[PDB]
Amino acid sequence: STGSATTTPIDSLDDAYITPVQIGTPAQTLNLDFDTGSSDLWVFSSETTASEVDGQTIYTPSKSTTAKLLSGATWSISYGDGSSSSGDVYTDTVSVGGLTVTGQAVESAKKVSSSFTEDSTIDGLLGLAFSTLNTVSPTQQKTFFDNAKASLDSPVFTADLGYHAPGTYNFGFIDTTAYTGSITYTAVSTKQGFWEWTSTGYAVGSGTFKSTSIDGIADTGTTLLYLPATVVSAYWAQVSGAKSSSSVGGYVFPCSATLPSFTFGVGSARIVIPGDYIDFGPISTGSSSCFGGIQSSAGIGINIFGDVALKAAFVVFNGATTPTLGFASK
Numbered sequence: 001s002t003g004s005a006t007t008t009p010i011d012s013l014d015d016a017y018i019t020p021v022q023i024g025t026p027a028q029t030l031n032l033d034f035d036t037g038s039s040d041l042w043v044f045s046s047e048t049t050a051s052e053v054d055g056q057t058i059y060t061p062s063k064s065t066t067a068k069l070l071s072g073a074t075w076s077i078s079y080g081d082g083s084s085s086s087g088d089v090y091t092d093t094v095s096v097g098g099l100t101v102t103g104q105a106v107e108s109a110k111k112v113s114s115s116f117t118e119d120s121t122i123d124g125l126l127g128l129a130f131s132t133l134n135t136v137s138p139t140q141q142k143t144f145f146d147n148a149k150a151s152l153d154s155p156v157f158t159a160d161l162g163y164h165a166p167g168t169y170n171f172g173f174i175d176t177t178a179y180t181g182s183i184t185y186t187a188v189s190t191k192q193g194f195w196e197w198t199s200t201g202y203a204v205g206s207g208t209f210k211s212t213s214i215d216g217i218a219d220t221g222t223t224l225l226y227l228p229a230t231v232v233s234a235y236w237a238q239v240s241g242a243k244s245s246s247s248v249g250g251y252v253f254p255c256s257a258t259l260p261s262f263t264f265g266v267g268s269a270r271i272v273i274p275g276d277y278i279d280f281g282p283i284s285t286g287s288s289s290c291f292g293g294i295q296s297s298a299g300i301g302i303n304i305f306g307d308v309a310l311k312a313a314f315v316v317f318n319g320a321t322t323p324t325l326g327f328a329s330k
Contacts, residue, residue, distance in 0.1 A: 224307070
């Protein structure tokens with residue numbers, strides 16, 4: 001089997017991407033944030049505290065003939081940005097882009113943090129990291145990909161995120177028309193439950209490539225590119241007037257700037273992030289100070305190849321017995 005679904009930015013800045021997902025019978029379609037950095041499929045639901053729902057589409061298990069309460073199971077998760085959610089668990093039929101899993105754990109939110117309430121466009125998350133990170137207790141549950149894997153034509157999914165445009169998540173096949181040149185594959189460590197890999201270095205604009213190992217995660221659920229402070233300083237030093245602002249919470253730059261590209265290494269291959277991808281616009285409405293899309297990972301504790309990086313590439317998440325990551329230009 002295979003699946004193919006379009007993923008769409010939630011706003012003009014590509015702050016996140018949503019992908020329609022069919023849950024239950026009859027289908028209830030919710031727009032979920034596909035997150036390769038976590039492993040819970042959770043949704044706004046009829047059980048969510050009413051004051052914490054503000055425009056989201058909810059899953060109502062009582063209207064689904066295939067929903068079954070997973071007795072005794074609860075979940076609770078916290079994300080890198082400090083947002084959180086928690087609740088109980090149903091199993092139900094879940095389809096993405098024509099690919100169907102029966103008995104998928106669908107984590108129903110009783111509580112969500114303000115950040116989620118305030119984003120009317122995201123109806124939940126669909127985790128695509130390794131199932132070892134799943135938070136369901138007392139019986140840990142498998143991700144959608146883990147459940148689908150054995151049925152897929154090939155045990156892979158691909159992320160093809162757009163810059164200010166829709167893109168695609170494919171399950172079970174590699175669309176050879178969706179990228180240019182070759183896909184370069186690189187080793188993955190699953191020891192922390194993430195798609196963790198080591199980039200071979202970087203360049204700023206037309207500068208010389210610096211060979212250096214940068215360990216980090218491929219995380220579709222993180223907006224920006226978070227890298228070591230040395231790397232980030234070298235990038236922003238090439239932008240006149242750029243500075244790290246403690247009050248704003250990272251590097252800002254004059255909105256009148258033309259940003260240089262940033263290149264990252266995948267083995268001997270190179271992925272080029274155009275400068276425009278690094279512009280996240282005014283820090284507040286009407287400001288001439290703009291927020292940068294490359295930020296320091298110092299104090300996160302891990303480097304994160306988020307959407308800013310991933311949207312510059314066609315990315316293969318290879319879930320073979322020994323998982324790997326593949327990157328191609330496009």
